[PDB]
């Protein structure tokens, strides 16, 4: 089925090769303690280069370590020489991007309401947070230290009727406290922007145009 040929580059550092006979195109994965692998960034990058890592056959390097009451998962992008690490704790989630060279902290974000953040074209983060009994899930992707691209907001448990029918753009976000849950370190101020193709789907699907008003898409 799947043979996971492993080995150890360094103490508590292991490489998980994913080889499948049908695919016949082995993959490479990372596995270890996130904290240890976020400081020796220069050392790990050298080893990866030395072990004959395919330059462009692999686009993203998956990493997903399992630890008690934690879920450290992420992917390092070899092409951009960057990295994304996600840590889901008992009460808060942390999303941090560190540039591989010189271990420079471009921008670190954190939220207390996001939980079970999964990683998916370009890979993008998804997360669900319920302020009240109703559960609300929103998809987003932070491009710059001061700008967040929050394209889609999945609603569940008849959320559309509960709130969308009532109000029927920024005022709605402020009302649901999207800004409050997002806490941006290294910068006090924060700005929100929307993707041109952004759509909100809860069955009712809506997508606002350039104007503040929000029209529907499919019903």
């Amino acid at each position: 089925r799947f043979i996971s040929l492993t080995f150890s580059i360094l103490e508590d550092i292991n490489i998980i090769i994913e080889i499948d006979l049908v695919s016949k195109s082995y993959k490479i994965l990372l596995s270890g303690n996130c904290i240890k692998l976020i400081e020796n960034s220069s050392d790990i990058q050298q080893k990866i280069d030395h072990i004959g890592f395919n330059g462009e056959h692999q686009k993203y390097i998956p990493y997903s370590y399992i630890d008690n009451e934690t879920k450290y998962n992420g992917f390092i992008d070899y092409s951009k020489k960057e990295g994304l690490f996600t840590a889901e704790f008992s009460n808060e989630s942390i999303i941090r991007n560190i540039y591989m060279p010189d271990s420079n902290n471009l921008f670190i974000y954190s939220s207390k309401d996001l939980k079970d953040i999964r990683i998916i074209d370009v890979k993008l983060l998804i997360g669900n947070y319920f302020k009240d009994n109703m559960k609300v899930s929103l998809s987003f992707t932070i491009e710059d230290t001061n700008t967040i691209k929050l394209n889609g907001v999945y609603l569940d448990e008849n959320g559309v009727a509960q709130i969308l029918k009532f109000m029927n753009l920024m005022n709605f976000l402020e009302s649901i406290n999207i800004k409050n849950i997002f806490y941006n370190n290294l910068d006090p101020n924060i700005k929100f922007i929307l993707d041109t193709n952004f759509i909100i789907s809860g069955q009712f699907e809506l997508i606002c145009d350039k104007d503040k008003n929000i029209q529907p898409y499919f019903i």
Partner: protein, 536 residues
């Protein structure tokens, strides 16, 4: 001209002070503060808080009495490192230590950039309940300065609320009363303040701190020392204006300057002592220094609590137009309940609590927190001055009952280089007398891995044991108040020292510590030290 720095009557170098007892460990400690309750001495440190029984033993090495352990959970040490702080900064640094009642203890720690507090028993040093939130009561970063004080069962604190330490605030809770805080993101109230000390006097709590001057903005960013009052019976504003905010918060600049043709102000407030009676006048002493990017200098000024209480009854200052000189608001335009007087006091009996304050008065005190006049120091001149040294005076401890007959005043000053300054303040111009200067740092027992941090973290005077405990980042030293032993058989020096804690005893035949109630006949000349006919 400028007053010259007086000469120390005696100097004690590290060679002699290398024999004073030192706490040490029995690894780093990161000691944060020290306070004394009864005979116990509490040493607040990283992940721990030690106790030392002062009335017991005098061994060359100080041994701990009881050791409380409070380590941050692994689930919390990791969530702090992920945020970006260094491993060394993601620990449980105790930054709040107060006595809750006759037997409880109130302890807060940074807990890896996640403040959380816990109640402890005094007799057994054991947890007394669950950990309630620490927001607005304990700082995130151990490098930051914070103030906390219990008054009438309530907890008054001043620190930063946010991880980035941008939103500094004064807070109150746990007093069976509603919580109150300064206006968020309002530079008129606090502009990047640095809190130093709070004291309880009468019906007000006074916070001493420094902040970027709002009136002195012509030159640029300048730091000014401030004092701020808050009523003890404040219960917040109305439902529409200043809800959950202070309704008596007023601030005024501290005046510590040498009066002349052009006054020279010491702006960087370093430390402030508690309310101490002296010559029948409730007074607090405060040390001020020059900015870090200026010529090093330090000054000690004293302030009468009556003058402080009287400066907040004066006129307010405002900006009639933006970017203009500040002018005192005429009294004819202030509405007549006085902004800042506590409900139920004189001439305000018609207002039960702060909630009944008229809207207009709440708005006025929200937009006019700064008082026009500056708090005048005693004698309008600093009591003490040092200007020919490279170190900067920080901490200050005062003994208002020093000497055989308990009618002197000896003030102890710390420095950023580990040097202790001692001078006999007099109480009616004060001539003053810079008694001694000493280096207490013990590199043999305080240095850790070839690192020397000499910043004094706290000083606590123990009148029962005639000792002064000076806490460093990595050690605590028990320095005797008198240091009579150094003089020894040199009667000429023992008399010329003019040290209140010392004296000459013919029965023993040597200079030695003098007890407050020592039947033995002592010979001293504190008034004027004449060595004629003696020595050398």
């Amino acid at each position: 001209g400028f007053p010259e720095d007086s000469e120390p009557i005696s100097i004690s170098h590290g060679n002699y002070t290398k024999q004073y007892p030192v706490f040490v460990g029995h690894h780093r400690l990161d000691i944060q503060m020290i306070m004394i309750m009864n005979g116990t001495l509490y040493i607040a440190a990283r992940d721990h808080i030690y106790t030392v029984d002062i009335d017991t033993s005098h061994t060359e090495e100080i041994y701990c009495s009881k050791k409380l352990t409070w380590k941050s959970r692994q689930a919390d040490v990791d969530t702090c490192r992920m945020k970006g702080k260094h491993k060394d900064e993601c620990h449980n640094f105790i930054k709040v230590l107060l006595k809750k009642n006759d037997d409880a203890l109130f302890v807060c720690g940074t807990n890896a950039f996640n403040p959380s507090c816990r109640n402890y028993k005094m007799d057994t040093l054991e947890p007394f309940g669950d950990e309630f939130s620490g927001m607005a009561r304990c700082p995130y970063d151990a490098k930051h300065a914070n103030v906390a004080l219990f008054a009438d069962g309530k907890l008054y604190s001043a620190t930063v609320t946010d991880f980035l330490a941008i939103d500094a605030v004064i807070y109150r809770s746990l007093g069976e009363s509603p919580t109150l805080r300064t206006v968020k993101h309002d530079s008129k109230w606090l502009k990047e303040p640095y809190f130093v000390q709070a004291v309880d006097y009468g019906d007000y709590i006074y916070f001493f701190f420094r902040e970027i001057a709002v009136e002195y903005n012509t030159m640029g960013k300048v730091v000014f020392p401030r004092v701020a009052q808050v009523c003890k019976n404040d219960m917040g504003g109305s439902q529409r204006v200043l809800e959950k905010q202070w309704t008596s918060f007023l601030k005024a600049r501290l005046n510590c300057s040498v009066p002349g043709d052009s006054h020279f102000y010491f702006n960087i407030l370093q430390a402030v002592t508690d309310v101490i009676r002296i010559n029948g006048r409730d007074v607090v002493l405060a040390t001020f220094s020059t900015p870090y990017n200026s010529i090093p200098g330090s000054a000690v000024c004293a302030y009468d609590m009556l003058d402080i209480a009287s400066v907040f009854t004066g006129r307010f200052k405002e900006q009639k137009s933006p970017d203009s000189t500040w002018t005192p608001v005429p009294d004819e335009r202030v509405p007549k309940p006085r902004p800042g007087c506590c409900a139920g006091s004189s001439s305000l009996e018609r207002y039960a609590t702060s909630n009944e304050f008229p809207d207009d008065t709440l708005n006025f005190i929200k937009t006019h927190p700064l008082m026009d006049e500056a708090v005048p120091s005693i004698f309008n001149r600093p009591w003490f001055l040092r200007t020919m040294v490279r170190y900067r005076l920080t901490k200050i401890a005062v003994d208002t009952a020093a000497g055989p007959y308990q009618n002197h005043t000896v003030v102890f000053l710390g420095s950023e280089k580990g040097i202790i300054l001692k001078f006999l303040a007099r109480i009616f111009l004060n001539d003053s007398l810079f008694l001694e200067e000493m280096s207490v740092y013990n590199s043999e027992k305080c240095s850790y891995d070839g690192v020397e941090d000499k910043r004094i973290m706290g000083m606590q005077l123990d009148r029962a044991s005639s000792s002064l405990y000076v806490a460093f980042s990595t050690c605590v030293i028990k320095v005797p108040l008198g240091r009579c032993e150094r003089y020894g058989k040199c009667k000429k020096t023992c008399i010329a020292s003019r040290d209140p804690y010392c004296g000459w005893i013919k029965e023993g035949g040597a200079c030695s510590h003098l007890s407050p109630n020592s039947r033995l006949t002592f010979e001293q000349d504190i008034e004027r030290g004449n060595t004629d006919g003696l020595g050398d």
